[PDB]
């Protein structure tokens, strides 16, 4: 392994580094930090435009991943299989198709559709890959056990809506793995529950906890904190390294789609963000050599990131404002820490990986004490060389859905889900003030409109031609309400009960 195929915790001050496999399985680091490659792999322009520009999503995934995963940890054959199977469940031949010049040619507004996977939400790109990864690593281990005493993992977590769907489809049917996901009853919209409870696979079982969602965090954090509950318990996270790694593929893919042939090789990505993982993957591609403009962070009212990038003050809010784009409604952007490590390393530790861990660890300590920390101007100045940000209100979110519906040209009446809207809204603000329409704008569409009907309906009610059922709801998604659900209620937030239900895996899990 080279400096890019080795990993360390953003909070560690030790010279020690672990393997890819270990970073992946461990998930979060013992000290609470996140894993990251101390050295970002460098790809030269020649290779980018002579060899990578001609590759398919899957082949790029291989080229990119070979840079962070050593041959020893995962051979070419095995890795190419993981990729092939991971993306074979995508309804688009391209996996992540770029829809170019949606609004005509007065500007260059491209929408990168990342919702063609099993659950119609962009988290499939990561989770399909990670799930297969887990199965692969767990398998090799057990490949020595004696059909008995063979380890088995059990992922457990709570869902406020969609998040869980992605995990369920990425772990469904994977050998020696089981997924138990708690969710507040009646608090989960129909379509999100249908995706979860519909899947036939046995290794999956959702729990309809009667209570609140913030109730489920504790009714599961307890099971998590453990007790005599040691048998290998998995975790439902957003900070796994494999996640970031999988998400890098489509930035490269779409970049080439937007520039191959064309004379303008200038492209700017606008990414509706929550926990920063998605856009952070774009950061990595940028540092690897992708010659792109500043990455645009688009957020909804929960603007912890927009505020930070503007003041250097990373302060957690008290209230989680409700918005039309729920999946970005967060108090603290978890992966942001990863960026802070690289920032701290370049502008405060003069390259010292270890002083960077010290610095980051103290910052997240101040957070867990004053709920806010200040960074030196050199940090925000360093971040502003690669990032721009925009805050999008609900009014603007809805109005953008309406504007694009009327405004779209290729195709006509293009419907946006609210999360993508937040992004297109920011994308349009940028087109306005960038003063360079030659720039290729690629706005990330993180969810298919059908996943958030309400926002789409309430914004397109004002059109006689609009019909959710005729223009949005996908046939494959229409069958859901008609498939057999596998519910399992748990009345009262009884941690003791959540435990018991989990235990009933009927031996044959
Ligand atoms: C999870 C999610 C987001 C947030 O992505 P991050 O990686 O957490 O920044 C945005 N949109 C949708 C539709 C999501 O499900």
Curated annotation (Swiss-Prot):
- Reaction equations catalysed: O-phospho-L-homoserine + H2O = L-threonine + phosphate
Give the miscellaneous note.
Present with 26000 molecules/cell in log phase SD medium.
User: Is Protein biosynthesis given among the entry's keywords?
Assistant: no
Its domain of life reads Eukaryota
Q: Which organism is it from?
A: Saccharomyces cerevisiae (strain ATCC 204508 / S288c) (Baker's yeast)
Q: Which cofactor does it need?
A: pyridoxal 5'-phosphate
- A cellular component annotation (GO) from this entry: cytoplasm
| Pathway recorded for this protein | Amino-acid biosynthesis; L-threonine biosynthesis; L-threonine from L-aspartate: step 5/5
Which InterPro entries does the record associate with it? Ser/Thr_deHydtase_PyrdxlP-BS, Thr_synth_N, Thr_synth_N_sf, Thr_synthase-like, Threonine_Synthase, TrpB-like_PALP, TrpB-like_PALP_sf
* PANTHER family hit by this protein: THREONINE SYNTHASE FAMILY MEMBER, THREONINE SYNTHASE-LIKE 2
Q: What family is it from? A: Belongs to the threonine synthase family.
GO biological process terms held by the UniProt record: threonine biosynthetic process
Any idea what this protein is called? Threonine synthase
An example of a Pfam family matching this protein is PALP
Under Enzyme Commission nomenclature, its number is 4.2.3.1
- Residues found modified as N6-(pyridoxal phosphate)lysine: 123
**Upper taxonomic classification of the species?**
Eukaryota, Fungi, Dikarya, Ascomycota, Saccharomycotina
